[PDB]
Design a binder for this molecule. Structure first.
Ligand SMILES: [Zn+2]
Ligand SMILES: [Zn+2]
Lengths: 598, 598
């Protein structure tokens, strides 16, 4: 069973060819993988245990049925085909093998006891993790008489005491020395089945996974993964004293491989090292698309290809996905400087606000969606809970802190009593949060960016009143926003006709990976610095704003707006990869700031 | 004695005839034993009415003991299986046997099963609660002595058991007087298992008494049958729990039958015959059902035409990843005493998955989903509300104007995106709640009055008014003639306890509940040639409600009514494309809903 399988696996690893494409025939597929493993670190080999289903079918029966008596063979049979690069580079740990599956195999509700201890794949949404837990591997005993130190191994899954000192023979003198033994790591994680793929009218389950030595911190709460690993069940004891174990076992999953393919979202900020992992064939594409005279309007108009025109709101929500530069003000003692853009959408009903939030929330990774009455003051920022076991008050994070890199869509912004609305004043302007409660005195921080939607008071935009009276928000809160979009839309007989003609079409029947990669690039390798010709159009653009907004009674302008222009101007330069702010990048993001309140 | 019973059961298992097989006299258990011998089946529901056909004595002594006999049967079949086609005779069982209740017994209630029926075959009826999830329960623990190279087993009966540290093989002990033996989860045998509680129907309880519970240990093949919050009927032995003389008892289920329909789960038996296709093919099949909805109620010819569309429901699209809901919501604003809480009570019973709720007796977290703690574990768990338990069905909320205003905005989420997004301090998820809501309310202060216009004797914020595709508006117009016919209807009802002979006798409830389930799965389309008609209609609406002094708030969410209120009709007529005759029916409905004011 052991020798008969490495011989059959090496063949696979050597002679395999696929009708597929990788990294955008080079026959030695897994030998090329094994070469890459040698040119860099990271001694793991991600094998797809379906390729081994084409090449063979009598190991693919024994890999998903005796996985713990096979995967060691799959390590050994890779160490030897590493002969090509043995002398060249000599790493230390070992080479590894990690079967997986592109597509899931089961749910969390159809795990049956004919599947105990055999490879299994599920999918879910990690809820919470834990801190590391040691786990002994090699004991280390020592006698009190002979003071002789033997080192017994854990082979089957338990540690046996020798009870005879190889020198003095006192028949029990061998204590166990803890901190001289060898330990390994172990983490406990909880999945939660996705809303899709669950029965009619039911509540999500959870499943406990156990990570191990190297996978120990490779996932975060809030991630959607495709875990692959063995499925085990261990007994439990009714007393922690007697050996009377129960008869109903308890199951978990010894994870073996993760996979976070989130193509429905963009790129999270764990892949900044992975931006250097772009095909140079692609950087040409991006740099060339960034030269067309209107790449702004060509990318913007590709957001949410179901909303009708609304041309400006998509401009704003596109500049929000880039944000101003991240300058480093630690020297001037000023503190830090917000670089993300907060957008407010106000306008009479039916104008498709909540659809834009529902679209963004499903686009950006690390986001949240909240509402008006179903969210409290402390549930948005940070609460203090009586931890159940230890009976102690411990801190937790709300919604505005769980996002932290992304967008916190807050629908129904009007219908939040003024208490829970005055909480956003801190987290949305300084990017911080200062907590001082019973035993907890700390100061969090986050890099969120609100995107709120409200209705006018009376829910009807009556043009008799003044703009600062249909909104009915204070000034110490309207100034923390910098793009207040008034969707003033009546019954334009032409607009209604065009919209209906568009909506009906959805009943008969640019790319993403351009945008999904353009964004990662424009985040990784761009930092627009102002100029002197741009800086000289930014001063007057604020001295006129005052005289304008003073009289009309619409919305006054405080010096904070002069920073927003910066935030907007720079954010425009990033769209075209210009790496330097010039004049036009101020006129554009000034016309945008002016022609939104009209 | 029993040695002669093991023969009187083999006779019956090998000899029994049956005619209803649609063929000649075959063997009901003759085929079963072959299937079981070929490992194509697991359970063998030995009916007891068939033993009570040729031996009404054995039935008397089964329901008297039912614990020995359920073992004699599993020995009889154990012997007969080889004759058709390890050491302990239970590790190689790989099938189980269950008694299907005898027809002569009567289904008790939970309160009735007393101590005088411990160890007998009983039958209870109740509502499920707190069904667990499947977990592996051991039956035959397999140990191994690694030293002497052997295999040993032991069978388990109690909910606990003490393992072995012997290796009692006298040879291993005799040779060396030393050796331990490991447990092992490969050679052993598990079996599915889950426990679930039952409660009395709060109907069949003394006027103010507390309902009592019982515990059910479902295991083997009956698992995953019952869902929590469900009417069920269980058949199984009633035993005490092992480990002074008082004892706690559980029901050990042998057969579980869903009785949702008040008779027996007949949803899977929804077969329409050609003699019914006769009716469904008639010219006005849509108009027979409309008249056969709550026939006890005179008048309201049009409301019953819309309450049917609500039960059928439109079709739901997904273009470019932009979901559109395919359910319909309906409100019934109207004067007092117009039989609205009768219409709702009827639409509750005509739906497979339904729920009933009252505005003044239900809190906003009890509709959607609530997070609640367990004082036994301190762990917060989720618990679905009304809209979750009514996932693929209908929810009914009467007294809708009296629901507290902070407990009513918790419906805006379920009416458009049809999820529930919880971010409380234990959980962070989105449950699926695809329910279609039907609500009733009184206009202003009990009665409509012609002084104040609409929107002020309705009192709904436009954001919620627009969620309803049809806000139907009835009145208690005291027209002398209209009252005379209504009275001559109700007095006929109170004389004969039936409705007066109508043009077409109403279909049974049991038959409509099938006619509709067959009429859901069509998915018609829309023809392009109609997009010009529809459009104009919509445009005209935006004119009237813009050039009037009473009309409600109409928006771009009205077009999708016309669209999704016509794919319902075209779904009744069994067409597979929407035709210009249904668009006009839809348009008439959306007009006959506010004419009751002119
Ligand atoms: Zn010693
Ligand atoms: Zn032995």
């Amino acid at each position: 069973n052991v020798a008969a399988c490495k011989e059959n696996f090496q063949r696979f690893l050597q002679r395999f060819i696929d009708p597929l494409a990788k990294e955008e025939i080079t026959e030695p597929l897994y030998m090329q993988r094994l070469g890459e493993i040698n040119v860099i670190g990271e001694p793991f080999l991600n094998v797809n245990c379906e390729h081994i289903k084409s090449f063979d079918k009598n190991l693919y029966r024994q890999l998903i049925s005796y996985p713990q008596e096979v995967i060691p063979t799959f390590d050994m049979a890779v160490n030897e085909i590493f002969f090509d690069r043995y002398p060249d580079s000599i790493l230390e740990h070992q080479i590894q093998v990690r079967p997986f599956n592109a597509l899931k195999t089961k749910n969390m509700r159809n795990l049956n006891p004919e599947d105990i201890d055999q490879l299994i794949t599920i999918s879910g949404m990690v809820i919470r993790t834990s801190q590391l837990i040691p786990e002994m591997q090699e004991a280390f005993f020592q006698c009190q008489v002979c003071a002789h130190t033997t080192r017994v191994e854990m082979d089957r899954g338990r540690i046996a005491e020798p009870s005879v000192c190889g020198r003095c023979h006192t028949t029990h003198s061998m204590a166990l020395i803890h901190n001289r033994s060898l330990f390994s790591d172990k983490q406990m994680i909880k999945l939660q089945e996705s809303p899709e793929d669950m029965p009619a009218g039911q509540t999500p389950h959870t499943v406990i996974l156990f990570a191990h030595n190297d996978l120990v911190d490779k996932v975060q709460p809030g991630d959607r993964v495709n875990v692959t690993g063995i499925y085990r069940a261990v007994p439990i004891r009714v007393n922690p004293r007697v050996s009377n174990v129960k008869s109903v076992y308890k199951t978990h999953i010894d994870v073996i491989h993760y996979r976070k393919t989130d193509a429905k979202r963009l790129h999270g900020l764990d892949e900044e090292a992975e931006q250097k992992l772009f095909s140079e064939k692609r950087v040409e594409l991006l740099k060339e698309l960034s030269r067309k005279p209107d790449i702004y309007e060509r990318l913007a108009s590709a957001l949410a290809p179901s909303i009708y025109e609304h041309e400006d709101i998509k401009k704003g929500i596109l500049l929000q996905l880039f944000g101003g530069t991240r300058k480093d003000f630690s020297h001037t003692g000023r503190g830090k400087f917000r670089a993300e853009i907060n957008i407010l959408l106000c306008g009479d009903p039916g104008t498709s606000k909540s659809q834009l939030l529902q679209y963004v929330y499903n686009l950006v990774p690390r986001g949240q969606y909240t509402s008006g009455k179903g969210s409290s003051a402390v549930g948005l920022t940070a609460y203090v809970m009586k931890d159940p076991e230890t009976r102690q008050l411990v801190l937790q994070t709300g919604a505005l802190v769980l996002s932290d890199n992304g967008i916190c869509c807050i629908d129904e912004f009007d219908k939040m009593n003024e208490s829970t609305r005055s909480v956003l004043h801190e987290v949305m302007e300084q990017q911080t949060l200062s907590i001082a409660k019973a035993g907890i005195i700390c100061q969090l921080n986050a890099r969120t960016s609100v995107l709120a939607a409200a209705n006018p008071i009376e829910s009807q935009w009556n043009p008799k009143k003044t703009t600062i009276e249909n909104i009915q928000l204070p000034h110490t809160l309207l100034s923390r926003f910098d793009l207040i979009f008034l969707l003033l839309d009546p019954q334009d007989e032409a607009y209604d006709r065009r919209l209906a003609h568009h909506l009906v079409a959805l009943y008969y029947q640019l790319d993403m990976a351009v945008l999904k990669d353009y964004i990662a690039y424009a985040h990784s390798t761009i930092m627009p610095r102002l100029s002197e010709e741009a800086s000289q159009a930014l001063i007057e653009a604020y001295v006129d704003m005052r005289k304008i907004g003073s009289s009309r009674g619409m919305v006054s302008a405080y010096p904070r707006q002069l920073e927003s222009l910066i935030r907007l101007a720079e954010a425009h330069a990033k769209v075209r990869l210009s790496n330097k702010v010039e004049a036009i990048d101020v006129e554009e993001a000034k016309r945008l700031h002016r022609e939104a309140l009209k | 004695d029993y040695a002669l019973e093991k023969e009187k059961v083999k006779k019956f298992l090998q000899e029994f005839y049956q005619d209803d097989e649609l063929g000649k006299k075959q063997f009901k258990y003759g085929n079963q034993l072959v299937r079981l011998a070929h490992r194509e089946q697991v359970a063998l529901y030995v009916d007891l009415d068939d033993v009570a056909e040729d031996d009404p004595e054995l039935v008397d002594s089964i329901c008297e003991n039912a614990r020995r006999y359920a073992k004699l049967f599993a020995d009889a079949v154990q012997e007969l299986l080889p004759q058709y086609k390890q050491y302990p005779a239970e590790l190689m069982r790989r099938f189980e046997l269950y008694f299907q209740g005898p027809s002569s017994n009567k289904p008790r209630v939970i309160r009735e099963v007393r101590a005088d029926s411990v160890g007998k075959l009983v039958t209870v009826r109740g509502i499920v609660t707190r069904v667990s999830e499947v977990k592996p329960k051991m039956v035959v623990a397999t140990y191994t002595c690694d030293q002497c190279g052997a295999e040993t087993y032991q069978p388990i009966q109690s909910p606990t058991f003490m393992p072995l540290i012997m290796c009692p093989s006298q040879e291993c002990q005799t040779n060396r007087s030393g050796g331990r033996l490991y447990l092992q989860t490969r050679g052993s045998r598990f079996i599915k298992f889950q426990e679930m509680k039952m409660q009395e129907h709060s109907d069949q309880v003394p006027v103010g008494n507390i309902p009592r519970s019982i515990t059910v240990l479902v295991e083997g093949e009956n698992t995953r049958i019952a869902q929590p919050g469900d009417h069920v009927s269980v058949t199984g032995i009633f035993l005490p729990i092992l480990r002074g003389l008082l004892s706690e008892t559980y029901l050990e289920a042998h057969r579980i039958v869903k009785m949702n329909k008040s008779e027996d789960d007949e949803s899977g038996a929804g077969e329409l015959t050609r003699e019914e296709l006769r009716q469904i093919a008639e010219e006005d099949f849509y108009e027979k059902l409309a008249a056969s909805i709550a026939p006890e109620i005179y008048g309201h010819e049009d409301v019953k035409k819309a309450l049917l569309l609500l039960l059928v429901g439109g079709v739901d699209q997904s273009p470019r990843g932009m979901k559109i809901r395919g359910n319909i919501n309906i409100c019934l604003m109207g004067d007092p005493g117009v039989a609205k809480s009768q219409l709702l009570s009827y639409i509750d019973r005509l739906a497979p998955r339904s729920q009933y709720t009252t505005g003044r007796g239900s809190s906003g977290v009890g509709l959607t989903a609530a997070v609640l703690r367990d004082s036994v574990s301190g762990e917060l768990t989720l618990e679905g509300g009304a809209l979750v338990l009514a996932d693929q069905g209908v929810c009914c909320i009467d007294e809708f104007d009296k629901m507290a205003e902070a407990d009513r905005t918790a419906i805006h989420e379920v009416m458009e995106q049809q999820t529930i997004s919880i971010a409380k301090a234990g959980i962070l998820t989105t449950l699926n709640a695809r329910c279609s809501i039907l609500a009733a309310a009184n206009p202003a202060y009990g009665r409509y009055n012609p002084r104040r216009s609409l929107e002020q004797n309705i009192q709904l914020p436009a954001a919620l008014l627009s969620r309803f595709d049809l806000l139907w508006l009835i009145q208690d117009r005291p027209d002398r003639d209209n009252d005379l016919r209504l009275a001559q209807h109700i007095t006929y009802v109170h004389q004969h306890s039936r409705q007066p002979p109508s043009q077409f006798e109403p279909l049974d409830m049991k038959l409509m509940r099938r006619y509709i389930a067959m009429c859901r799965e069509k998915q018609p389309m829309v023809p392009e040639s109609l997009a010009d008609y529809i459009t104009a209609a919509y445009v005209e609406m935006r004119r009237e409600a813009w050039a009037s002094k009473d009309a409600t708030y109409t928006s771009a969410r009205t077009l999708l009514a016309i669209l999704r209120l016509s794919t319902a009709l075209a779904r009744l007529r069994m067409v597979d494309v929407v035709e210009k005759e249904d668009v006009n029916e839809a348009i008439r409905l959306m007009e006959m809903s506010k004419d009751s004011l002119l």
